[PDB]
Design a protein around this ligand. Structure first.
Ligand code: MG
Ligand code: MG
Ligand code: MG
Ligand code: MG
Ligand code: MG
Ligand code: MG
Ligand code: MG
Ligand code: MG
Ligand code: MG
Ligand code: MG
Ligand code: MG
Ligand code: MG
Length: 74
RNA sequence: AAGGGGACCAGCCUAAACCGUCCGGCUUGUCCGGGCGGGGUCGUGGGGCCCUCGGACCGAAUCCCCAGCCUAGCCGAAG
């Protein structure tokens, strides 16, 4: 069963990563303890749209810096 | 059972794509979810979106009126 980790779990996966676990593990351990969420279509988009937003506000930083490296350095 | 002969006869509304709006979720938006409205309903496949072209006739199974009908009755020839 595919789940999206909400946290880094040792010998499991990284936060935001999609891993495969047995249904019992997900239903009776991860989901109740807030450690993961079902890799459903609905929030596979939620993860995706946040990976997209994080990249958006990052490349905006690496370009509002360069526009300052423009004025300075000259 | 098909088929044939007859009785009767009638076909419609949705879900999803996509659009809009409201609400709340927290993991902040190009988000996800819930409601509502639009859109759509098909097998010659149909629909959505995007271009190009083109701009009155049907009509309920719903509501209204009426005829007709029922729930009392009446006239009715000639020793
Ligand atoms: Mg028959
Ligand atoms: Mg027949
Ligand atoms: Mg008959
Ligand atoms: Mg018929
Ligand atoms: Mg809001
Ligand atoms: Mg939804
Ligand atoms: Mg909605
Ligand atoms: Mg059609
Ligand atoms: Mg088609
Ligand atoms: Mg109807
Ligand atoms: Mg009499
Ligand atoms: Mg008499």
């Amino acid at each position: 069963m595919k789940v999206i980790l909400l946290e880094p779990l040792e010998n499991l996966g990284d936060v935001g990563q999609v891993v495969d676990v047995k249904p019992g593990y997900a239903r009776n351990y991860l989901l109740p303890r807030g450690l993961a969420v079902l890799a459903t279509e609905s929030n596979l988009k939620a993860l995706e749209a946040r990976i997209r937003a994080q990249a958006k506000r990052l490349a905006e930083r690496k370009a509002e810096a360069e526009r300052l490296k423009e004025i300075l350095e000259n």
